[PDB]
Design an enzyme around this catalytic site. Structure first.
Site, short mmCIF file in Angstrom:
data_model
loop_
_atom_site.label_atom_id
_atom_site.label_comp_id
_atom_site.label_asym_id
_atom_site.label_seq_id
_atom_site.Cartn_x
_atom_site.Cartn_y
_atom_site.Cartn_z
N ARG A 204 -48.44 -10.37 28.10
CA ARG A 204 -47.19 -10.61 28.35
C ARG A 204 -46.50 -9.82 29.32
O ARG A 204 -45.67 -9.90 30.05
CB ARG A 204 -46.25 -10.88 26.91
CG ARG A 204 -46.65 -11.97 26.20
CD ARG A 204 -45.81 -12.90 25.18
NE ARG A 204 -45.13 -11.73 24.36
CZ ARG A 204 -45.30 -11.18 23.12
NH1 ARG A 204 -46.50 -11.54 22.86
NH2 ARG A 204 -44.46 -10.83 22.80
N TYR B 227 -44.50 -10.45 32.68
CA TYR B 227 -43.04 -9.86 32.82
C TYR B 227 -43.09 -9.28 34.16
O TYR B 227 -42.18 -9.21 34.97
CB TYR B 227 -42.66 -9.08 31.74
CG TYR B 227 -42.65 -9.88 30.20
CD1 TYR B 227 -42.45 -11.17 30.38
CD2 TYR B 227 -42.78 -9.15 29.14
CE1 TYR B 227 -42.78 -11.78 28.85
CE2 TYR B 227 -42.89 -9.76 28.01
CZ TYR B 227 -42.79 -11.00 27.84
OH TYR B 227 -42.85 -11.78 26.63
N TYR C 275 -33.21 -18.23 29.16
CA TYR C 275 -32.37 -18.92 27.96
C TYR C 275 -31.62 -17.84 27.07
O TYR C 275 -32.14 -16.76 27.01
CB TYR C 275 -33.14 -20.05 27.22
CG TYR C 275 -34.08 -19.35 26.25
CD1 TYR C 275 -35.47 -18.81 26.81
CD2 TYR C 275 -33.75 -19.10 24.65
CE1 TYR C 275 -36.27 -18.21 25.92
CE2 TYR C 275 -34.55 -18.66 23.94
CZ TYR C 275 -35.76 -18.05 24.32
OH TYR C 275 -36.82 -17.44 23.51
N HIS D 227 -28.83 -15.27 25.75
CA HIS D 227 -28.24 -14.09 26.60
C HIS D 227 -29.52 -13.62 27.22
O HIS D 227 -30.53 -13.27 26.70
CB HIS D 227 -27.61 -13.34 25.62
CG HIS D 227 -27.14 -12.05 26.41
ND1 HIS D 227 -27.90 -11.04 27.12
CD2 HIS D 227 -25.97 -11.72 25.91
CE1 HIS D 227 -26.91 -10.17 27.45
NE2 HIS D 227 -25.76 -10.38 26.86
N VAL E 90 -30.71 -10.08 25.98
CA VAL E 90 -31.06 -9.97 24.61
C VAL E 90 -32.66 -10.45 24.18
O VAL E 90 -32.91 -11.64 24.45
CB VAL E 90 -30.05 -10.91 23.61
CG1 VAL E 90 -30.27 -10.98 22.30
CG2 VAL E 90 -28.92 -10.16 23.94
N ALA F 42 -29.13 -16.18 20.35
CA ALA F 42 -29.52 -16.95 19.08
C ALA F 42 -28.77 -16.23 17.90
O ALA F 42 -28.53 -16.97 17.13
CB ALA F 42 -31.05 -16.73 18.83
N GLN G 271 -38.00 -12.81 16.44
CA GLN G 271 -39.68 -12.93 16.77
C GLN G 271 -40.24 -12.68 15.58
O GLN G 271 -41.61 -12.15 15.46
CB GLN G 271 -39.97 -11.69 17.83
CG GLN G 271 -39.26 -11.96 18.93
CD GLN G 271 -39.71 -11.65 20.59
OE1 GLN G 271 -39.45 -12.11 21.56
NE2 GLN G 271 -40.41 -10.73 20.46
N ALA H 76 -31.63 -22.59 15.27
CA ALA H 76 -30.26 -23.11 16.00
C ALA H 76 -30.90 -24.61 16.70
O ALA H 76 -32.05 -24.42 17.23
CB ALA H 76 -29.95 -22.12 17.23
N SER I 5 -37.87 -19.29 15.60
CA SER I 5 -37.44 -18.89 14.14
C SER I 5 -36.88 -17.49 14.13
O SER I 5 -37.36 -16.47 14.90
CB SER I 5 -38.55 -18.89 13.21
OG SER I 5 -38.87 -20.23 13.07
N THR I 6 -35.66 -17.40 13.59
CA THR I 6 -34.94 -16.19 13.22
C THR I 6 -34.73 -15.91 11.78
O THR I 6 -34.59 -16.94 11.03
CB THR I 6 -33.72 -16.03 14.07
OG1 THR I 6 -34.12 -15.94 15.51
CG2 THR I 6 -32.86 -14.82 13.77
#
Ligand code: SAH
Ligand code: SAH
Lengths: 14, 384, 384, 14
Positions: free
Chosen positions: B66, B70, B92, B94, B97, B124, B166, B207, B238-239
């Site tokens: 990743r 990035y 997506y 903010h 964040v 989120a 995460q 959400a 999922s949070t």
């Protein structure tokens, strides 16, 4: 089961 | 002075609707748009707004670091900045964040002397506060990445909100188009058991991403996260929200130094302003209409605006130009380049309005647009 | 079924531009709008969008209990809900972040059986992350109200971000139109000195409220907050950011359980992903273009989308209806009332698109709008 | 010197 991870922590990603 | 700019904006979480007006205006004004979004209706919407878009999601790959993705996402945006283009990156939520490449690309652009800005968006966590009906103020909020939380043994407060992002990719460095099994999820559950106990509530939060969907607000015990059918439900979006276990007492030294006296009329630490957090275990019923509430409502009948209240007193021409400065990035750039020239070319402004825009002073604009009573200014602590 | 609804929305912080598209659409659709905003351009903008607006700010008064104001603000909104109207409340920023009356009014509406929703917005903390170029993920974020922080002795982590709201009204219960002297500000500074030391940085943050303004990002030592000329600068829209003092080491047990092995290639705790937090004291220079970064960029020349990448493959008719569901609350209510009737009345949908809307399934809509390659579905962990 | 405080903590407001 959307997978849009735009971050990883130092220790994990590399 | 230097050609080329980078503006990174968000889309928020819920498809299209959670984009800010300014994020939309910068996407429309861009020479080139780079985006990384979750839902296809948001992607389709962006493509209707700019003819030169690139999907950053194509730079992920199975077993591909990743970090390498990035670096590539960042470099695609900064390459176009260096060519003297006004570039907009879109992430997506903010865009700062839990996002690596936005911070990377903005810092590189800034370091090489280009204009570089991040516009905030709805995260989120913003969605979580709205959907779970909690306020981070009451009683404070700790926010961590789930892998970081474990690896650096980040502290919990049993008296404050805990939010974990995460949680569906605990310990995972890379990427797979079909997602992850999340086989190290049990390491997270072991920590939550140590900190909170097997019977403490954890809220699985997702959400709604499309406008008709309901959020997932599924309360489980820490123990239940061990059941394979439940662990299975935690994915890439999922949070977790873990509510406080206890209410914290007041410090007598601070009660004395802030003069919240007599100590005796300070409410019991169990006392709550309505409403109570519904997710806290064994949360007592709180009365919404105490005698003091009823007395305040009784006063509404006789209410008039206080003498120091400042009613809006503006003009179509002034609201129009202040709207244009917020919604037209080209108009804003022109105004910032020459306040006087811009102000003198706006039609239908009154002399006061023209004068306030020429100055640009936030206070000058405020009494061009609001009636400041003599009552206010006899007291007013603006030394003028 | 029951007549009357309450939707509470935000405006974000920066005038007009930081409002979400959905917040705007609900303000336009409302029977009655109640607002509490800071800047007059945002107020004027709202009044152009709905003919039936009430300013909640008139319910503050000198020496009047803010709790009594909040009870009154709530009751004005819920009275109109009870009369069967679609009511929208509007608070600046995120309407649930450090806001009493939104939570109160929504909980009362919900308890009496009315439709009640909060839409998230851009908070002052969202602005802080964007303007100070920090990510709450790295290295975690603690957020408190300044008076609460002191009275309940809320814990700090010297290894994570600290954000403090309402630092300009430490210990203050009431209201004054000309603001507060903030005479108990020194109690906050004493705590910051105990936790961080006299030489530790504190950032005085004020997000730009008008589109042409720069944010205040003024770094002071804890010691400097004691100088009267600096203390004086902290007001009703001041937030503090206190950066971490140290980097936290990794836990060997978690490194082993998450299989981040060998331990030896785990980076030093001082190691940072570019970029470093610029506000941290004695932050080392971090190289943006390490050999691994340069190798990742070299791969861009030969890059093609991976076989499992899902290109957008939609239609004007489908993007149009998904946009309408996000931007038209009346269309959304109609669709939620009868998926089939709504779907069968949309012009120009393909059979697949019509079918996906009839179902409403988030996954059905996704492969109506995206080409899922056979490569993805041979792996895909959607049991179907 | 905008003053739009829409929150207070238990212990302070009443
Ligand atoms: N629909 C959603 N509901 C809840 N959490 C979500 C979410 N989408 C993303 N997240 C959270 O965000 C993590 C990805 S990191 C990107 C976060 C995004 N920039 C934001 O502003 O929120 C996920 O692992 C999850 O913890
Ligand atoms: N322009 C601004 N810049 C920085 N902080 C601000 C701000 N406006 C408000 N705040 C913060 O918010 C507090 C008021 S409480 C209301 C916060 C708002 N709902 C939000 O979403 O942010 C202030 O005391 C201050 O700490």
């Amino acid at each position: 089961f959307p997978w849009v991870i735009v971050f990883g922590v130092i220790g994990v990603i590399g | 002075t230097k050609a080329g700019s980078l503006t990174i904006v968000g889309t928020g979480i819920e498809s299209i609707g959670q984009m800010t007006l300014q994020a939309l205006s910068y996407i429309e004004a861009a020479a080139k748009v780079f985006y990384c979004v979750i839902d296809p209706a948001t992607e389709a919407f962006i493509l209707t707004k700019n003819k030169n878009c690139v999907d950053l999601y194509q730079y992920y790959d199975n077993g591909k670091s990743r970090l390498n993705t990035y670096t590539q996402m960042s470099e695609l945006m900064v390459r176009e900045v260096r060519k003297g283009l006004d570039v907009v990156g879109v992430f997506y939520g903010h865009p700062g964040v839990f996002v690596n490449p936005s911070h990377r690309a903005l810092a590189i652009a800034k370091s090489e002397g280009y204009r570089a800005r991040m516009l905030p968006g709805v995260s989120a966590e913003d969605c979580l506060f709205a959907d779970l009906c909690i306020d981070p103020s009451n009683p404070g909020c700790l926010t961590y990445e789930a892998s970081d939380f474990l690896i650096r043994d980040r502290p919990v407060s049993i008296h404050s909100h805990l939010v974990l992002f995460q949680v569906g990719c605990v310990g995972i460095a890379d990427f797979n188009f079909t997602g992850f099994d999340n086989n190290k999820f049990g390491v997270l559950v072991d920590r939550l058991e140590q900190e909170y106990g097997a019977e403490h509530p954890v809220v699985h939060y997702i959400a709604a991403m499309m406008p008709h969907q309901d959020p997932v607000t599924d309360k489980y015990t820490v123990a239940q996260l061990r059941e394979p059918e439940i662990a299975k439900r935690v994915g890439g979006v999922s949070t977790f929200y873990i509510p406080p276990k206890a209410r914290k007492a007041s410090n007598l030294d601070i009660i004395r130094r802030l003069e919240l006296l007599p100590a005796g009329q300070v409410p019991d630490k169990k006392a709550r302003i309505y409403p109570a957090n519904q997710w806290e275990p064994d949360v007592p019923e709180v009365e919404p209409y105490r005698p003091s509430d009823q007395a305040a409502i009784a006063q509404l009948a006789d209410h008039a605006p206080p003498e120091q209240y400042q009613p809006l007193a503006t003009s179509k021409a002034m609201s129009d130009v202040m709207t244009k400065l917020a919604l037209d990035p080209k108009a804003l750039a022109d105004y910032k380049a020459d306040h006087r020239a811009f102000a003198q070319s706006v039609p239908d402004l009154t002399p006061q309005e023209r004068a306030a825009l020429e100055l640009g002073d936030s206070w000058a604009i405020r009494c061009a647009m609001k009636n400041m009573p003599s009552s206010l200014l006899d007291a007013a602590r603006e030394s003028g």
